[PDB]
Design a protein around this ligand. Structure first.
Ligand SMILES: C[C@H]1O[C@H](O[C@H]2[C@H](O)[C@@H](CO)O[C@H](O)[C@H]2O[C@H]2O[C@H](CO)[C@H](O)[C@H](O)[C@H]2O)[C@H](O)C[C@H]1O
Lengths: 210, 211
């Protein structure tokens, strides 16, 4: 049916430039506008291209930054972003538009991160307190995303909360918690397992009373 | 320029009718502004709803309708379902730019309200050993998904040094979020009492510890 397929995750340095792609399927490309949308934790319109006659509209704010193109042959629209800064880190969407609208069907979004940080392993710390008890693990200072966290090698699935990463001093920090019966710990061990594939890190942290 | 304004959060019950509005700083919204409405669900899942002021996009349920109600564009959901709990953004075509509203968080009460479980954890000794101190406040199981987090160090409000994640949806459809206070072990040792204060639906939950 209609599908707008986007390219994947991009990692880039300051000053550099990147090209993102968006392929149309289930409709005639040349009769619709392909728009591009920036999401940074608010939404902003970048601009739009009409592939049948290659007309474009830009947001004035993005005129110096973006270049939109389309190939009616490979049914792909493209966006070039140049002179990257950290302010360009955001998720970007391409959307299908027509008369009076910009986006009935949306792509899934391609994530862009602009950073000069290098690949760093996480430092993992146990979070002990000292009816039910809540234990946690802090995954601090890693780059890039993602880390995965299991508890007791996946055995402890129930009551587990892994939080979204926040950026602190250009590296990520994440935490995960598990709540277990208070009669169960310290008696039955609780270990968090953190893997960070980019730095091929695999670390286990037993939670011990304080 | 033009600023587009929307309610920031609305709450309704399943079966009820709710209306979301979209106003512009350049005066009345008209037809030539082609008001668009779209929906954001958990995990960057966007769905176009309304195009050109009132056209339903393909496969949008008929309970969603768009209209002008006076000087404003509005989205009316007649008979709201639990799956309509989402962020709704309007946009207007103005001076050859699509300009976005801030988005409205709509809660459609699919289950009873739930107060947050707040846990505050001290820095681990292993971290202190690196000359750093991070306090972690985890906030889970609250519904509606709207929370304000404040940090207090010896009663003084903390204005720098903390990070809070945007509320995230749990698998049981309640919400969770975490907040961090990072200090150097020297600032950590200069104060006795630390508090994580979470306000949900007018009520505050406070968790405190002492060094
Ligand atoms: C990108 C842009 O696409 C749509 O507007 C276009 C119209 O559909 C076509 C034909 O009707 O003409 C123009 O290329 C676009 O018109 C928009 O811009 C004109 C410029 O004179 C006017 O402002 C029109 O009101 C406006 O529709 C879509 O409707 C809006 C936008 O996403």
């Amino acid at each position: 049916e209609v599908q707008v397929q986007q390219s994947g995750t991009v990692l880039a340095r300051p000053g550099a430039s990147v090209k993102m792609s968006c392929k149309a399927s289930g409709y005639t490309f040349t009769n619709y506008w392909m728009h591009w949308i920036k999401q940074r934790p608010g939404l902003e319109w970048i601009g739009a291209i009409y592939p049948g006659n290659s007309a474009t509209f830009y947001n004035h704010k993005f005129r110096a930054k973006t270049k939109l193109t389309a190939v009616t042959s490979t049914i792909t629209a493209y966006m070039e972003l140049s002179s990257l800064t950290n302010e360009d880190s955001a998720v970007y969407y391409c959307t299908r538009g027509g008369h009076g609208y910009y986006g009935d069907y949306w792509g899934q979004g391609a994530s862009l991160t602009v950073s000069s940080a290098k690949t760093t392993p996480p430092s993992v710390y146990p979070l002990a307190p000292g009816s039910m008890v809540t234990l946690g693990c802090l995954v601090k200072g890693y780059f890039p995303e993602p880390v995965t966290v299991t508890w007791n090698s996946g055995s402890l699935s129930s009551g587990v909360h892994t939080f979204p990463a926040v950026l602190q001093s250009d590296l990520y920090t994440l935490s995960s918690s598990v709540t277990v019966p208070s009669s169960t710990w310290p008696s039955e061990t609780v270990t968090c397992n953190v893997a960070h594939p980019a730095s091929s890190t695999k670390v286990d942290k037993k939670i011990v009373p304080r | 320029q033009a600023v587009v304004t929307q309610e920031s959060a609305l709450t309704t019950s399943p079966g009820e009718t709710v209306t979301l509005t979209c106003r512009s700083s350049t005066g009345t919204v008209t037809s030539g502004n082609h008001a668009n409405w779209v929906q954001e669900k958990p995990d960057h899942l966007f769905t176009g709803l309304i195009g050109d002021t009132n056209n339903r996009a393909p496969g949008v349920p008929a309970r969603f309708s768009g209209s002008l109600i006076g000087d404003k564009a509005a989205l009316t959901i007649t008979g709201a379902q639990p799956e309509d709990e989402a962020i709704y953004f309007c946009a207007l075509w103005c001076n050859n730019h699509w300009i976005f509203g801030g988005g409205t968080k709509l809660t459609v009460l699919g289950q009873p309200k739930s107060s947050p479980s707040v846990t505050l954890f001290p820095p681990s000794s292993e971290e202190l050993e690196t000359n750093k101190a991070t306090l972690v406040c985890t906030i889970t199981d609250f519904y509606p998904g709207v929370v304000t987090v404040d940090w207090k160090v010896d009663g003084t409000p903390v204005t720098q040094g903390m990070e809070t994640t945007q509320p995230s949806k749990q698998s049981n459809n309640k919400y969770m979020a975490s907040s961090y206070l990072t200090l150097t072990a020297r600032a950590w040792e200069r104060h006795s009492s630390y508090s994580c204060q979470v306000t949900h639906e007018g009520h505050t939950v406070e968790k405190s510890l002492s060094r």
